[PDB]
Amino acid sequence: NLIGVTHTEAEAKALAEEVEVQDGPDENGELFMRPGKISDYFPKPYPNPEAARAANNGALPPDLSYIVNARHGGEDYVFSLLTGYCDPPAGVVVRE
Amino acid sequence: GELELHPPAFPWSHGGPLSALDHSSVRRGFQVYKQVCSACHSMDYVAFRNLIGVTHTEAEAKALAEEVEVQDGPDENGELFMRPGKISDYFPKPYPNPEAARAANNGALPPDLSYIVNARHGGEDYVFSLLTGYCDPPAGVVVREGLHYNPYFPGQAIGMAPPIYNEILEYDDGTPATMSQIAKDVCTFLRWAAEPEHDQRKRMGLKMLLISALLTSLLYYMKRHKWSVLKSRKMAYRPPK
Amino acid sequence: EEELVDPLTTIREHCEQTEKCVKARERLELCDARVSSRSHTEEQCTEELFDFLHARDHCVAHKLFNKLK
Amino acid sequence: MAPNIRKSHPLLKMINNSLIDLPAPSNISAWWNFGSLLAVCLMTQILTGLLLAMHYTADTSLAFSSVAHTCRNVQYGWLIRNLHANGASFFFICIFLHIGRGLYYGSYLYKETWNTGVILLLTLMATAFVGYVLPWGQMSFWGATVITNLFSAIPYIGHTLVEWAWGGFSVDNPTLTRFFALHFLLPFAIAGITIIHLTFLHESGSNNPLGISSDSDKIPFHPYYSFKDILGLTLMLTPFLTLALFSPNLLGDPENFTPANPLVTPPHIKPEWYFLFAYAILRSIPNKLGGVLALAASVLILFLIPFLHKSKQRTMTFRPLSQTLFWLLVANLLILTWIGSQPVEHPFIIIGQMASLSYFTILLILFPTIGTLENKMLNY
Amino acid sequence: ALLRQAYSALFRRTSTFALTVVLGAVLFERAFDQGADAIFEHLNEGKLWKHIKHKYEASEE
Amino acid sequence: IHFGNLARVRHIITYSLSPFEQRAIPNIFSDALPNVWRRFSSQVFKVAPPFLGAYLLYSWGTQEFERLKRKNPADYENDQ
Amino acid sequence: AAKNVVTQFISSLSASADVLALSKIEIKLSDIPEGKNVAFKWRGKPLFV
Ligand code: HEC
Ligand code: HEM
Ligand code: HEM
Ligand SMILES: CO/N=C(/C(=O)OC)c1ccccc1COc1cc(C)c(I)cc1C
Ligand SMILES: CCCCCCCCO[C@@H]1O[C@H](CO)[C@@H](O)[C@H](O)[C@H]1O
Ligand SMILES: [Zn+2]
User: Fold this and answer.
1) Which of F3, F14, F63 to mutate to test the interface with D (most CBs of D within 10 A)?
2) Among B26, B206, D112, D215, which residue's Cβ finds the most Cβ atoms within 10 Å?
3) For chain B, where are the E strands, in sequence order?
4) Number of structural domains, chain D?
């Protein structure tokens, strides 16, 4: 998708090679590893939500594909969230 | 093209338009699969619940389904885990993917046996003869290392090892485990497994034939009745001359 | 006294000794005999064999199930 | 405006003047029942069709399993399925009788009613063709590939038409899905045209077995033909149910009980009986392009029929010669059918080419010729 | 004289007629099934689970 | 209006009786069957022939196919 | 016939063999200790006992 958009057909190939993907099975039935190709989708950082929650405290870092159109205010909103963390005002106690 | 040998036609208990499945046999047939075929053969479309009211008690089934461990999850860690089987579970695959099965059968892929009978020409008549029917090759026929001879299978070289042999297990119902007796049952089971409806469908056919015959007769009267007016009709051409 | 025998192989016998089965089982051996002796023949007694089994088994079917349960 | 309430109601005036007060010959036979049957048939397929569609999943990884689930899990699912697959046949049977009838009584002189007919058939044919792929079984798959692959015989403008039709480079999901959509659609389009069909008919009324003005003696559709029609229905519905309730798969090939696998090809690839005759003609000509044409024309030919009528009389009732030529033709189809259920080895092949060769020859030369010659024997 | 009596109380008024079919049908169903089911089963004596059930229902372990 | 414009017909009388006054399927033997035969008879020699003439070709075609599968002992008379 | 065929098709849309399977879940009252809580899974949503 990146090609013709933000990268060269070259950049992308390489860019996609920086990752290892799970393909197969092979002649033995085992799953194996291989270097990424342009026809590959951006790697998941986890294998399933139950796991992600595990490494973020119950919190589930939502897939960011459609995120902007998924929250009210889109980018205007997704911006302010990032650029905008701060200390709580009086009476506001944030759980550990 | 080439020469084949068509299986004869055994008079299966359930071969009649009005004859159901000898559930007694099926129950056994089941075991034959459960303790023999379910070693290389999958039956993905059946599940222990299906057995209830058919060949086992709701009790038998539960227990029967518990004899297995299944993979569920993920859990509150994401890992997959193990648990004992429940009726709502489908008969366990003996492998995880063909590529693997082939690996443990010499390229050969023991096909899922769910719809098998309706998947091969001659159904059970066929699937029977195959089992009860392996033998030595005739002159000129050399079988490659790894395949066994069976005239009832195209190419005569099947990758399946003769699966049954007298007393290869024991029917806890008492029936003598003679080979054919096994193949008989397993085939019968195969039919059920492939079309549970079987019975109810034939029970319907009956009802349908009865209503049908009666309602056609009735309609035929009424058709004639009304039409009489025309078929009885008489006409004359009387000009003024 | 109670020696477990597969009705199959029994009825298989009874049939092999039958007008058709015999006039076939004979047709085979004849093939086999020559085919086996010969070293350079492409011949195969498949046909003949089938002829036999086709006959044998037909017979088998007609009776084999009366014995099984 | 009017006394009763079925002639002054812009709706009942259409449920009436088309099925109750409708002027019908008094002598039409059983070969006229296929009309309504064909209809009723549709009315049913569509219904069972939906009922299934409500449980189907069009996807090369669930199509088979869904259909299977539909049978094993859905209440009366299996029943509903049978009826549909068999409804298909019942449908064709009725169509073929319907068509034969029209040929044997020159109903095709009703040009429009005829051409609409032909189209209706075409649509029905296409319709099944797609519906077959849905269960995505071996035959489902391969039948798709074999047929769709013919298109690539057209020069230039085809090698593309195909990859477009597939949505890819081979029959795959992209196809399945679009076929399902198509199978959902076409039936309706059939229902639609069927309306136009019956209209062009009501512009002249039914042709009768004798082939002479019925005006001298016509009867009201009801109860005469409404009654006849229902009896006709039962006299068919019986075997339809009889086979579909006692011998389900008698008709359907088994290779379709084996989940489609693009890697392995079935021993023999052969369609459902109602496509056999055509299959046989396709396979008679060795040359994808030619065979394609022969297939096309093998069915398209129908359109010509009207322009190939030479007898001074309409129905063959009073034309012995034509009649046997007609039955020679019918049997000529049986053969083609049979030849289609067989491989491509002698004698079949030669018998094949002949049958097809005679099929066209009859509808193109004999029929029109024996017709003329017939006329002169009447001394006309 | 059933035919008479019938044509009078039943098949006369298109109302009692219909009313008969309804009720009539009710009876038909209720008793056509029995017969059919019974016939069917008989033709399959001891093959159905309805028969071989006594062998595991409260008689094992 | 489709009942009246049809055609000009004169001097024809027709008499018919209510269904109730006449018989349901009258004279099954004296009239019915005899005609059922008549009809059958008249057509057989038109229809039947080619159908029959096909059964042959089907038979020969099929029958002969099998024959071409069995081996010809003459191919193997000098394979010593 | 009518009545039947119609019943047949109508029950067709109601729940199927499988969905009716996960329908119910039972719990043994003779394996749960005092105080401690254990949660299962029912009609998708967890169940507390
Ligand atoms: C030892 C593993 C093994 C077991 C256990 C086994 N089979 Fe098979 N079976 C196979 C294999 C492998 C094949 C495939 C051979 C081939 O297709 O070349 C096969 C194929 C089949 C086929 C037929 C394939 C065809 O095309 O006709 C059927 C039917 C079948 N098995 C039935 C059974 C039955 C019945 C049982 C149990 C009573 C059974 N098998 C037990 C290994 C086994
Ligand atoms: C889509 C399905 C079709 C339906 C549901 C249908 C229905 C009908 C109906 C209701 C009639 C009136 C009664 C009768 O059958 O004689 C009719 C007549 C006719 N149909 Fe069709 N038809 C169909 C297909 C066709 C086809 C494929 C042809 C042939 C190309 C065709 C040709 C005719 C002709 C010529 C008549 C005139 C009947 C006569 O001679 O009186 N129809 N059709
Ligand atoms: C023109 C009338 C119809 C014809 C001739 C027809 C024919 C068929 C055929 C040929 C099949 C293959 C059946 C098999 O597996 O043996 C089929 C399947 C199916 N049809 Fe139809 N169909 C018709 C209408 C419909 C309609 C209107 C729908 C719904 C809009 C529908 C939905 C399906 C579905 C879900 C399947 C796939 C699952 C299955 O095979 O049962 N059909 N149809
Ligand atoms: C998707 O394949 N469907 C098939 C079928 O028979 O569906 C009912 C099928 C299966 C195996 C081989 C060929 C086909 C389709 O063949 C066709 C299809 C159509 C339309 C016609 I005109 C003529 C022929 C010969
Ligand atoms: C020509 C019209 C024939 C209609 C026949 C109606 C047959 C439907 O009969 C069905 O039989 C099943 C088996 O016992 C039952 O389980 C169903 O409830 C019943 O409706
Ligand atoms: Zn096949």
Assistant:
1) F3
2) B26
3) 69-72, 81-84, 148-149, 157-158, 234-237
4) 1
Q: Phi, psi at residue G30, to the nearest 5°?
A: -120, 50
C-alpha to C-alpha distance for B139 and B131, rounded to whole angstroms? 22
What residue has token string 């019943």? Answer: G7
Q: Which two tokens stand for residue B157?
A: 């070289």
3-state secondary structure C4-45: CCCHHHHHHHHHHCCHHHHHHHHHHHHHHHHHHHCCCCCCCC
E45: CATH? 1.20.5.260
Given in angstroms, what resolution was this structure solved at? 3.5
CA distance B26 to F53: 47
Angstrom distances, CA of residue D58 to CA of D50, D84, D129, D256 = 14, 17, 16, 16
Structural domain span for residue E36: 1-61
D360 contact partners, CB below 8 Å, separation of at least 6:
D297, D298, D301
3-class secondary structure, A14: helix
| F window 7-66, beta carbon within 8 A of D | 7, 9, 46-47, 49-51, 53-54, 57-58, 60-61, 64-65
DSSP codes joined into one string, D313-350: SSSGGG-HHHHHHHHHHHHHHHHHHHHHTS-S-TTHHH
User: Domains of chain C, with CATH numbers?
Assistant: 1-69 (1.10.287.20)
The SS3 assignment for F62 reads helix
The angle, 0 to 180 degrees and rounded to 10, between the axes of the packed helices D320-340 and F33-67 is 40
What is the total count of domains within chain F? 1
What CATH number corresponds to the domain at position D305?
Answer: 1.20.810.10
Around Cβ D58, how many Cβ atoms within 10 Å?
20
Amino acid found at D123? T
| Cβ atoms of residues G17 and D73 within 8 Å | yes
Distance to chain A for B71, nearest Cα, Å: 16
Tokens of D362: 């009859």
CATH code at position F55? 1.20.5.210
User: Domain residues for F7?
Assistant: 1-80
Ligand 1 pocket member B32 (CB < 6 A): yes
C67 vs C65: CA distance, rounded Å: 5
Nearest by Cα to D258 from B93, B118, B122, B43: B118
Q: How far is CA B68 from CA B62, B85, B88, F9, in A?
A: 11, 5, 12, 87
How many degrees, rounded to 5, is the angle at CA G43 between CA G38 and CA G48? 20
* 8 A C-beta contact, residue D336 and residue D139: no
- How far apart are the C-alpha atoms of D324 and C2, rounded to whole Å? 70
